[PDB]
Amino acid sequence: MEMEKEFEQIDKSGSWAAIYQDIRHEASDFPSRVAKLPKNKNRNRYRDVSPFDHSRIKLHQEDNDYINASLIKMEEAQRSYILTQGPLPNTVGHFWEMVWEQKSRGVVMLNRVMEKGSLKCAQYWPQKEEKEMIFEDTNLKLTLISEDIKSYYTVRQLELENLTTQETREILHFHYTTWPDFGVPESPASFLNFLFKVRESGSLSPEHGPVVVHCSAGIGRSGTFCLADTCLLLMDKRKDPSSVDIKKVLLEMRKFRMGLIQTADQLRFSYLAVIEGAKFIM
Ligand SMILES: Cc1sc2ncnc(N(C)C)c2c1C
Ligand SMILES: Cc1sc2ncnc(N(C)C)c2c1C
Ligand SMILES: Cc1sc2ncnc(N(C)C)c2c1C
Ligand SMILES: Cc1sc2ncnc(N(C)C)c2c1C
């Protein structure tokens, strides 16, 4: 079926939970043996969210190459994304090592450091120009260059230096700051505006390594971001945009990381975002 009318048909019939459970039943199951090794317990935020072995990002290290991060490679859309958990106190150096080694231009953050009164990720970037951060375990230096605070999101320019080679690179930090503590946003308008700002920066384009996107577990809000981006790109590329099947795209993405889209409300919100977004593109 088309999307917008499939949408109203699920609303009128109140069957979002049943649709979402079907997706959960059909999703791929691949091994994640490296994630479950005992030496990696303090590298995982949640025991039930792990990268598959076949798609995990490897650190360029011989001691321990493990990080909780996955490469989502979308062949028809010609887009790739790295989805990862919010960094932990003992993985902030690994996180920036990955950004460096994968040649990423942008980092997309969809959570606040504290939500619901608890810490959802480490304070992994510097908050003042004159107070830079040094990650001694991976030999990197990170400096805040500029910050632009808007009503729904903040954009930061960061300098990452590889202290071993003295090479430097500019990284863009795109921080969506207004996702509610509970539920999903009422309108997709600010989320779509944010997606378009990431696109306009070059961070999603083939001349750079894959964008790094995270929330707390790296599957819910993060899944919504890449699902909406890929569906909108396919609607532009195909002769028949009504042929784009958001459930089929989501199942393809779930071949590369488990659990993408965590609730039926996030599934409905993803439909809403693609539907409204397709009208603005034209
Ligand atoms: C006026 C300019 S030039 C420039 N180059 C890189 N990053 C920037 N941000 C997002 C702060 C800027 C701004 C705000
Ligand atoms: C002159 C340039 S280059 C560039 N790259 C990314 N974003 C931009 N804007 C609009 C915030 C710009 C602008 C305004
Ligand atoms: C040279 C660059 S990169 C970039 N990314 C996001 N916003 C920006 N602007 C318009 C403030 C910029 C600028 C000016
Ligand atoms: C939903 C939105 S916001 C926005 N801002 C600038 N350009 C856009 N297009 C057409 C690429 C969009 C779209 C499609």
Burial group, residue 32, by CB count within 10 angstroms (0-12, 13-18, 19+)? buried
Q: Which domain holds residue 21?
A: 1-282
Interhelix angle 221-237/264-281, rounded to 10 degrees, is 30
CB-based burial, 198-233: b 16+ in 10 Å, e otherwise: beebebbeeeebbbbbbbbbbbbbbbbbbbbbbbbb
Cβ count near 20 (within 10 Å): 20
User: In this structure, are strands 140-149 and 118-119 parallel, antiparallel, or unpaired?
Assistant: unpaired
Q: Is 192 in the pocket of ligand 4 (CB under 6 A)?
A: yes
| Separation of CA 194 and ligand 4 centre (Å) | 10
Both tokens of 270, joined, read 């993803």
Q: Contact 214/85 with Cβ under 8 angstroms?
A: yes
Residue located nearest, by CA, to atom 8 of ligand 2: 201
119: domain CATH number is 3.90.190.10
Residue located nearest, by CA, to atom 5 of ligand 4: 196
Residue located nearest, by CA, to atom 12 of ligand 2: 201
Binding site: which residues? 181, 215-221, 262
For residue 155, the ligand 2 atom closest to its alpha carbon is 11
Residue 196 vs residues 54, 120, 180, 186: alpha-carbon distances, Å: 31, 25, 20, 19
User: Three-state SS string across the chain, please?
Assistant: CCHHHHHHHHHHHCCHHHHHHHHHHHCCCCCCCCCCCHHHHHHCCCCCCCCCHHHEEECCCCCCCEEEEEEEEECCCCEEEEEECCCCCCCHHHHHHHHHHCCECEEEECCCCEECCEECCCCCCCCCCCCCEEECCCCEEEEEEEEEECCCEEEEEEEEEECCCCEEEEEEEEEECCCCCCCCCCCCHHHHHHHHHHHHCCCCCCCCECEEEECCCCCCHHHHHHHHHHHHHHHHHCCCHHHCCHHHHHHHHCCCCCCCCCCHHHHHHHHHHHHHHHHHHC
Q: Is 201 in the pocket of ligand 3 (CB under 6 A)?
A: yes
Distance of alpha carbon 219 from alpha carbon 175, whole angstroms: 17
Residue 144 vs residues 105, 177, 178, 229: alpha-carbon distances, Å: 15, 18, 22, 28
**Structure-token match 């202290």, residue found:** 163
Residue 260 vs residues 75, 155, 222: alpha-carbon distances, Å: 18, 25, 8
Q: Contact 30/53 with Cβ under 8 angstroms?
A: yes
| Separation of CA 52 and ligand 1 centre (Å) | 37
Burial group, residue 78, by CB count within 10 angstroms (0-12, 13-18, 19+)? exposed
Would you say the C-alpha torsion 114, 116, 117, 119 has a positive or negative sign?
Answer: negative
| Separation of CA 26 and ligand 3 centre (Å) | 42
Residue 140, beta-bridge partner list: 135, 162
Chain length of the chain:
282
Active-site residue set = 215
Residue 50, beta-bridge partner list: none
The method of structure determination was: X-ray
Identify residue 82 by its one-letter amino acid code: I
Residue located nearest, by CA, to atom 14 of ligand 3: 201
**Count of domains observed in the chain:** 1
Distance of alpha carbon 201 from alpha carbon 222, whole angstroms: 19
User: In this structure, are strands 211-214 and 106-109 parallel, antiparallel, or unpaired?
Assistant: parallel
Ligand 4 pocket mutation pick from 195, 199, 280, 282 by most atoms within 8 angstroms of CB: 280
| Separation of CA 203 and ligand 2 centre (Å) | 12
Torsion of CA 98, 102, 106, 112, to 10 degrees: -20
Q: Contact 122/87 with Cβ under 8 angstroms?
A: yes
For residue 155, the ligand 3 atom closest to its alpha carbon is 6
